[PDB]
Write a protein that binds this ligand. Structure first.
Ligand SMILES: COc1cc2c(cc1OC)CN(C=O)CC2
Ligand SMILES: COc1cc2c(cc1OC)CN(C=O)CC2
Ligand SMILES: [Mg+2]
Ligand SMILES: [Mg+2]
Ligand SMILES: [Mg+2]
Ligand SMILES: [Mg+2]
Ligand SMILES: [Zn+2]
Ligand SMILES: [Zn+2]
Lengths: 325, 323
C-alpha cells in the first residue's frame, strides 16, 4: 500500500536526511501536512496544547494550499523540509530541557509558515518592479512580513484556530516569538544575525548538566532565530542526492526570475541568468560565504552535536568544487 | 480668499494660524499649505512637478485624512508640514540638506498620519485588527500611512514624482520611509539618544553651522526634525496649543469609550471619567517634549531659542492651572 510506504518513510522524521521528496509524492503532495502532523504527535503537542486533531489537519491543509504548487523551490516541500530540519535541531543534546513547550511550538509553527504564499521572486525583484507587496510593506522584509500575515490570517478560517485552547498570555507570547523568528529568515538580516550568534558562542554559558544556559528573552529568541535560519539554509548540509534536487529547484526558480528581469530590461540578478550561469561555482560560493560560516558557528554553539552535519556540508562543498575544473 | 492669502503670508513663521487657514480654505489646509510651501521653495520648477498634478495629489491625500478624527486629521498634517518647513530653514542647518532631502522631509510630513483611524497602535494590536495582522504588530499605523501615501501617487494625474529619475525616486522613497517610521512614539527614546550623541560630537563652522558628512547622521536629523514637528503643539502660541490639547483629548476619550464598551482596560489619558488634562500636559512636556526640544535647540543653537521659550512659558501656564 502507498500508505504503508508513507508510514515507513515517516518513521525517519527524527533523522537528518529524511526522504522528503518521496514523502511529498507518497502523501499526494501533502508533505507539510503529514510531516507537521507526525512531528506534533511525536512531541505530544496536541495533548499539551489541547489542539483538536481535525483543527490541526484543517489548518495544515489550508496552510499547505497557500504555498504555490507552481514555484520550483519556495513551495510546500521546502516548508516541510524546514519544519523537519528545525524539529531535528530542537532535539540536539546541547538544548535538552532548554526550551519550553510554547517555544518549541513557536519554532515549529514559524518554520511551517515561514515562506507561505511565496511568489518565487526575491524581495529585491518585488521592490524594483514596484510590486503591490513592496508598496504594502515599505520595501522592508517584504516577503517575510507577508508570510507571517498569511500564516496568522489562515488561523481565522473555519476550524483552523490550532491555538484556540492556549491562554491569552500564551497566544501573545507565541505570536511575538513567531514574528521574531520569521523576520530573521530575511537574508538581509543574515550578517547581523551571524555576528550576534558568534558573540554568543564566544561568551556561551553551560549549565551543570552541560546544556546551554539561556536566561533572558533576547538570548532564547536569538537561538531560535538562528536555528530556523540554519534549517532554512540547510540544503547543502543534507545527503548529496537531496542537496542536488534542491539546487536544481532553486536554479529553476532563479532562472525564471532572471527571464522576467531580462524581458523588462533590468539588470539580471546574481545567479539568475540561464545564459551566463555557473551553477557549481554558485554553490561553492554560497557555501563558502553564507552556509558554512553559519553552520560552523551553530556547530560551535552545540559542539559536538552537529559535527556529522558539518562534515556532510564540507563533503558536499568538495564535491561541487570537484565538478568545476 | 483674500484673507486666506493674508494668513498664508505667515507660512515661514512658527505659529501660523492653521485653524483659520483650515476654515478659510474650505477644510483644505493640507492642500493650500503644501502648495504654498512648494511654490515658496521653488520645488515645482526644481522637480518639474506639473501644478495640476500636485494639486490633484494633494486633494486626494487630504481626502484620505478622516474628517471625523479630532486630532489625527488633515489640519494636523498641514501643521506638521508647515512646522517641518520652518525647521528646515533653521540658520544652523544651512547647507546641510539637498533639495531631494528637503522634498523628502516635506512629503513625509504631509503623508505621515494619512488614513489614521484615531486609535493607537496598542489599541489596534489588542483588538486583533486587520492592520496589526498585516503589519505584524510593528509600527502598524506608520507602515499604513506610508503605504497609503505612496499608493495614492498611482491615481490618475497624481504622480508628482513623474519627472524624477528612477534613482531620485528610489532615494526619496527610502528617506520618506525612514522618516515616517521614526514618528512611531515607540522609537522616541532611541531617536532622542541618537540626537544627543550627535549634539555631543557636533561639528560646526565658525559661523555655528552644522556639518553633517554622512547619510546616517543626516537622516537621523531629518527623523528628529519631523518628530519634533509632530511633537510641536506645546511649543506653539498658547491659543493654538490649547486647541490641539482639546483635540487630542477628544480623540483619546473616544478611544477610551471604545475600550470601555469592549470591556478593555482604558489606555492612559483616555478615561474621560478619570482624566487630568492639565497634569497630563505638564507630564508630557516634562518627560517627552522638553527633553526632545532642549536637545534640538542644542543642535541648532541658538536658533530654536524662541520655540523653546514658548514651550517653557506654556508649561508654566498649564502648571498654574493645577490647584
Ligand atoms: C546559490 O544556491 C542557493 C541560494 C539560495 C538558496 C538555496 C541555494 O541552493 C540550494 C535559498 N535561498 C532562497 O531564497 C537563498 C539563496
Ligand atoms: C499628553 O498630550 C499629548 C500627547 C500626545 C500627543 C499630543 C498631546 O498633546 C497635544 C500627540 N501624540 C499622538 O499620538 C502622542 C501623544
Ligand atoms: Mg527507509
Ligand atoms: Mg497553493
Ligand atoms: Mg523566505
Ligand atoms: Mg503618527
Ligand atoms: Zn525558506
Ligand atoms: Zn502626527
Amino acid at each position: 500500500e502507498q500508505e504503508d510506504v508513507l508510514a515507513k518513510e515517516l518513521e525517519d522524521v527524527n533523522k537528518w536526511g529524511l526522504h522528503v521528496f518521496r514523502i511529498a509524492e507518497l502523501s499526494g503532495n501533502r508533505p507539510l501536512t503529514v510531516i507537521m502532523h507526525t512531528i506534533f504527535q511525536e512531541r505530544d503537542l496536541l495533548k499539551t496544547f489541547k489542539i483538536p486533531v481535525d483543527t490541526l489537519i484543517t489548518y495544515l491543509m489550508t496552510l499547505e494550499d497557500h504555498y504555490h504548487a507552481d514555484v520550483a523551490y519556495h513551495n510546500n516541500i521546502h516548508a516541510a523540509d524546514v519544519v523537519q530540519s528545525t524539529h531535528v535541531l530542537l532535539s540536539t543534546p546541547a538544548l535538552e530541557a532548554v526550551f519550553t513547550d510554547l517555544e518549541i511550538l513557536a519554532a515549529i509553527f514559524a518554520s511551517a509558515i515561514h515562506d507561505v504564499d511565496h511568489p518565487g521572486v526575491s524581495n529585491q525583484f518585488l521592490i524594483n518592479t514596484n510590486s503591490e507587496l513592496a508598496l504594502m510593506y515599505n520595501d522592508s522584509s517584504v516577503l517575510e512580513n507577508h508570510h507571517l500575515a498569511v500564516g496568522f490570517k489562515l488561523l481565522q478560517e473555519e476550524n483552523c484556530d490550532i491555538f484556540q485552547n492556549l491562554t491569552k498570555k500564551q497566544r501573545q507570547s507565541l505570536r511575538k516569538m513567531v514574528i521574531d523568528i520569521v523576520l530573521a529568515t530575511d537574508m538581509s538580516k543574515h550578517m547581523n544575525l551571524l555576528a550576534d550568534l558568534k558573540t554568543m558562542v564566544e561568551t556561551k554559558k553551560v549549565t551543570s548538566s552541560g546544556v546551554l544556559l539561556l536566561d533572558n528573552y533576547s538570548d532564547r529568541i536569538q537561538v531560535l532565530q538562528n536555528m530556523v535560519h540554519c534549517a532554512d539554509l540547510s540544503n547543502p548540509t543534507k545527503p548529496l542526492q537531496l542537496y542536488r534536487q534542491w539546487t536544481d529547484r532553486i536554479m529553476e526558480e532563479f532562472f525564471r526570475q532572471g527571464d522576467r528581469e531580462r524581458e523588462r530590461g533590468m539588470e539580471i540578478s546574481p545567479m539568475c541568468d540561464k545564459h551566463n550561469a555557473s551553477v557549481e561555482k554558485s554553490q561553492v560560493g554560497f557555501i563558502d560565504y553564507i552556509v558554512h560560516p553559519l553552520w560552523e558557528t551553530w556547530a560551535d554553539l552545540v559542539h559536538p552535536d552537529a559535527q556529522d552535519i558539518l562534515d556532510t556540508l564540507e563533503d558536499n562543498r568538495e564535491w561541487y568544487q570537484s565538478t568545476i575544473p
